[PDB]
Design an enzyme around this catalytic site. Sequence first.
Site, PDB file in Angstrom:
ATOM      1  N   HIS A  37       0.747  -1.102   0.012  1.00 25.02           N
ATOM      2  CA  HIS A  37      -0.127  -0.062  -0.029  1.00 25.02           C
ATOM      3  C   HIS A  37       0.723   1.150  -0.029  1.00 25.02           C
ATOM      4  O   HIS A  37       1.981   1.217   0.844  1.00 25.02           O
ATOM      5  CB  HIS A  37      -1.264  -0.096   1.021  1.00 25.02           C
ATOM      6  CG  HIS A  37      -1.701   1.302   1.434  1.00 25.02           C
ATOM      7  ND1 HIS A  37      -1.317   2.014   2.543  1.00 25.02           N
ATOM      8  CD2 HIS A  37      -2.647   2.062   0.762  1.00 25.02           C
ATOM      9  CE1 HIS A  37      -2.059   3.113   2.438  1.00 25.02           C
ATOM     10  NE2 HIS A  37      -2.862   3.077   1.549  1.00 25.02           N
ATOM     11  N   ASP A  38       0.638   2.288  -0.644  1.00 27.07           N
ATOM     12  CA  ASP A  38       1.158   3.541  -0.769  1.00 27.07           C
ATOM     13  C   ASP A  38       2.817   3.179  -0.917  1.00 27.07           C
ATOM     14  O   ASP A  38       3.688   3.599  -0.264  1.00 27.07           O
ATOM     15  CB  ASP A  38       1.220   4.168   0.360  1.00 27.07           C
ATOM     16  CG  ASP A  38      -0.069   5.437   0.288  1.00 27.07           C
ATOM     17  OD1 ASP A  38      -0.305   5.645  -0.765  1.00 27.07           O
ATOM     18  OD2 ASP A  38      -0.705   5.343   1.194  1.00 27.07           O
ATOM     19  N   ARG A  47       0.876   6.089  -6.798  1.00 27.82           N
ATOM     20  CA  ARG A  47      -0.119   7.409  -6.840  1.00 27.82           C
ATOM     21  C   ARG A  47       0.633   8.418  -7.458  1.00 27.82           C
ATOM     22  O   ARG A  47       1.768   8.773  -7.049  1.00 27.82           O
ATOM     23  CB  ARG A  47      -0.598   7.307  -5.294  1.00 27.82           C
ATOM     24  CG  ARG A  47      -0.797   6.475  -4.570  1.00 27.82           C
ATOM     25  CD  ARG A  47      -2.356   6.054  -4.983  1.00 27.82           C
ATOM     26  NE  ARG A  47      -2.982   4.977  -4.039  1.00 27.82           N
ATOM     27  CZ  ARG A  47      -3.587   5.369  -3.260  1.00 27.82           C
ATOM     28  NH1 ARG A  47      -3.777   6.467  -2.501  1.00 27.82           N
ATOM     29  NH2 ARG A  47      -3.655   4.377  -2.085  1.00 27.82           N
ATOM     30  N   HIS A  87       1.580  11.691  -1.970  1.00 25.97           N
ATOM     31  CA  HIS A  87       0.589  10.995  -0.902  1.00 25.97           C
ATOM     32  C   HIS A  87       0.020  12.415  -0.409  1.00 25.97           C
ATOM     33  O   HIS A  87       0.279  13.161   0.068  1.00 25.97           O
ATOM     34  CB  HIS A  87       1.506  10.875   0.730  1.00 25.97           C
ATOM     35  CG  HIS A  87       0.506  10.279   1.649  1.00 25.97           C
ATOM     36  ND1 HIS A  87      -0.498   9.197   1.501  1.00 25.97           N
ATOM     37  CD2 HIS A  87       0.008  11.004   2.724  1.00 25.97           C
ATOM     38  CE1 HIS A  87      -1.372   9.295   2.508  1.00 25.97           C
ATOM     39  NE2 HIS A  87      -1.053  10.192   3.225  1.00 25.97           N
ATOM     40  N   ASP A 118       0.549  -2.693   4.589  1.00 24.22           N
ATOM     41  CA  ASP A 118       1.529  -1.589   4.830  1.00 24.22           C
ATOM     42  C   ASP A 118       2.615  -2.465   5.584  1.00 24.22           C
ATOM     43  O   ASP A 118       2.415  -3.672   5.877  1.00 24.22           O
ATOM     44  CB  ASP A 118       1.180  -0.701   5.918  1.00 24.22           C
ATOM     45  CG  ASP A 118       0.140   0.635   5.217  1.00 24.22           C
ATOM     46  OD1 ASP A 118       0.069   0.744   4.010  1.00 24.22           O
ATOM     47  OD2 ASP A 118      -0.485   1.197   5.939  1.00 24.22           O
TER      48      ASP A 118
HETATM   49  N1  LIG Z   1      -7.109   9.897   0.337  1.00 22.62           N
HETATM   50  C1  LIG Z   1      -8.050  10.082  -1.079  1.00 22.62           C
HETATM   51  C2  LIG Z   1      -8.297   8.851  -1.511  1.00 22.62           C
HETATM   52  O1  LIG Z   1      -8.385   7.799  -0.552  1.00 22.62           O
HETATM   53  C3  LIG Z   1      -7.537   6.666  -0.606  1.00 22.62           C
HETATM   54  C4  LIG Z   1      -7.141   6.274   0.913  1.00 22.62           C
HETATM   55  O2  LIG Z   1      -6.492   7.594   1.440  1.00 22.62           O
HETATM   56  C5  LIG Z   1      -6.257   4.935   1.012  1.00 22.62           C
HETATM   57  O3  LIG Z   1      -4.992   5.264   0.664  1.00 22.62           O
HETATM   58  C6  LIG Z   1      -6.974   3.854   0.105  1.00 22.62           C
HETATM   59  O4  LIG Z   1      -6.053   2.678   0.196  1.00 22.62           O
HETATM   60  C7  LIG Z   1      -7.100   4.407  -1.174  1.00 22.62           C
HETATM   61  O5  LIG Z   1      -7.814   3.197  -2.289  1.00 22.62           O
HETATM   62  C8  LIG Z   1      -7.979   5.391  -1.258  1.00 22.62           C
HETATM   63  O6  LIG Z   1      -8.402   5.691  -2.614  1.00 22.62           O
HETATM   64  O7  LIG Z   1      -9.272   9.036  -2.689  1.00 22.62           O
HETATM   65  C9  LIG Z   1     -10.629   9.449  -2.325  1.00 22.62           C
HETATM   66  C10 LIG Z   1     -11.483   9.318  -3.658  1.00 22.62           C
HETATM   67  O8  LIG Z   1     -13.013   9.433  -3.220  1.00 22.62           O
HETATM   68  C11 LIG Z   1     -10.136  10.601  -1.633  1.00 22.62           C
HETATM   69  O9  LIG Z   1     -11.411  11.356  -1.566  1.00 22.62           O
HETATM   70  C12 LIG Z   1      -9.378  10.649  -0.371  1.00 22.62           C
HETATM   71  O10 LIG Z   1      -9.292  11.996   0.264  1.00 22.62           O
END
Ligand SMILES: N[C@H]1[C@@H](O[C@H]2[C@H](O)[C@H](O)[C@H](O)[C@@H](O)[C@@H]2O)O[C@H](CO)[C@@H](O)[C@@H]1O
Length: 296
Positions: free
Chosen positions: A32-33, A69, A82, A274
């Site tokens: 993740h990330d 991302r 991020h 993670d």
């Molecule tokens: N952080 C933005 C992001 O959220 C992420 C999460 O943070 C997280 O990493 C998850 O595992 C991803 O799958 C998810 O997409 O996308 C949304 C779109 O609706 C925005 O609204 C949020 O603010």
Amino acid sequence: ASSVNELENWSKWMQPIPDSIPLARISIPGTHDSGTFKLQNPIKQVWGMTQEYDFRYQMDHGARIFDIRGRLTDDNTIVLHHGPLYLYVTLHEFINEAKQFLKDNPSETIIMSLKKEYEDMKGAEDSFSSTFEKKYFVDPIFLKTEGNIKLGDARGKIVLLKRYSGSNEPGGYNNFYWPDNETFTTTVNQNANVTVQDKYKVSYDEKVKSIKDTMDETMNNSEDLNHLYINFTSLSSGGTAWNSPYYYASYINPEIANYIKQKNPARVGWVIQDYINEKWSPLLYQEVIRANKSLI
Ligand SMILES: N[C@H]1[C@@H](O[C@H]2[C@H](O)[C@H](O)[C@H](O)[C@@H](O)[C@@H]2O)O[C@H](CO)[C@@H](O)[C@@H]1O
């Protein structure tokens, strides 16, 4: 060859699996990330860091799914972010690590999920999807085959999992409705379904149940080859040492790892985690990889 011991080489664990097996049916560790490993500022680390090691360390530990991302810059390149923060890592930087890894271990495949994480810088010439496709995807390492991709067609290549709209080039897994903070089920490509557990903003308790329940649904639908099951064990929260992704993962990883260990299942799904490291036991990524003994 034909030994479960071959699943034990984290660098070539996909070597023993049959070419005919759809990638979807394989249990695959993911991160993740993935690009947050260069974060060094304490405050930034608390709020955004999810990995401690680089892409290559991640793939040598068996991870085959990368959650990338990006963000379109003025210079018309895509860098990693991020949220609003730039991670000092680029898309090229990721692709090159994957290229080297796939060269040394040609038995493997790398699935790359790409999401537009932040809005394009004001002076860019093209759209995010357009730049990505004309400037990167066009590279031959990208599989341009769609459908229920088989392992045989994927080895040696990078398989795209689109988390962006406006794609005009065929290949990999197509974009699909992905609602916020939930577990859902929809359809991808042509006929294949997908169920995702991505409750990133919930309580620890709700999280572990969401993971286990999606994992249960997966081991009970072990032979449904056309069903993707993506399950994120990652959880985000506040800004302190006993609230950060590191804190949660230190609990969630060994807990889920043992949960898989004892159930001895045939299918676990795509488990995105993670902190892929070697601190906690049992190792989540290793248990996920072992749920593949049934394919051999
Ligand atoms: N952080 C933005 C992001 O959220 C992420 C999460 O943070 C997280 O990493 C998850 O595992 C991803 O799958 C998810 O997409 O996308 C949304 C779109 O609706 C925005 O609204 C949020 O603010």
